[PDB]
């Protein structure tokens, strides 16, 4: 185990250009509203989604999220557009109803 937020979270969706918002059950089995910012977490590396303190959004458009995986279209260094997918279930975690990067 190294996180697993999608296991205790529902209604996962993308907000803004690089934001993920969802509801996660707290210790008392109560579902609360929480959000994880991907702009400072996720980045765009040559059109590929990788973890780094850089906003992929600067080279990506039409960002979308489904469950625990993030789907977005990013520009490639050689020119053009390409969408990549990445699983954050490991990076993000559910801390008392809050998405945490650890």
Swiss-Prot record:
Protein family according to the UniProt entry: Belongs to the cyanovirin-N family.
Additional information: Its activity in situ is unknown, however it acts as a viral entry inhibitor, inhibiting HIV-1, HIV-2 and simian immunodeficiency virus (and some other viruses such as feline immunodeficiency virus, measles virus and human herpesvirus) infection and replication. It prevents essential interactions between the envelope glycoprotein and target cell receptors by binding to carbohydrates on viral protein gp120 and possibly by other mechanisms as well. Addition to cells must occur before or shortly after virus addition. Is remarkably stabile; the protein can withstand multiple freeze-thaw cycles, dissolution in organic solvents, treatment with salt, detergent, H(2)O(2) and boiling without significant loss of anti-HIV activity.
Keywords: Antiviral protein, Disulfide bond, Lectin
GO biological process annotation, one example: regulation of defense response to virus
Presence of the UniProt keyword Zinc in the record: no
Protein name, UniProt field: Cyanovirin-N
Known role: Mannose-binding lectin.
Gene3D superfamilies: Cyanovirin-N (2.30.60.10)
Pfam families reported for this sequence: CVNH (PF08881)
Record annotation: effect of changing residue 82 to A/Q/V: Prevents N-glycosylation upon overexpression in yeast without changing anti-HIV activity
Effect of residue 54 to P: Protein is exclusively dimeric and has moderate anti-HIV activity
Assembly, per entry: In solution exists as a metastable domain-swapped homodimer which very slowly converts into a more stable monomeric form at room temperature. Under physiological conditions it is unlikely that the dimeric species exists and indeed the monomer is more active against HIV. Interacts with HIV-1 gp120.
PTM (free text): Cleavage, or reduction and alkylation of the disulfide bonds results in the loss of anti-HIV activity.
InterPro entries associated with the record: Cyanovirin-N (IPR011058), Cyanovirin-N_sf (IPR036673)
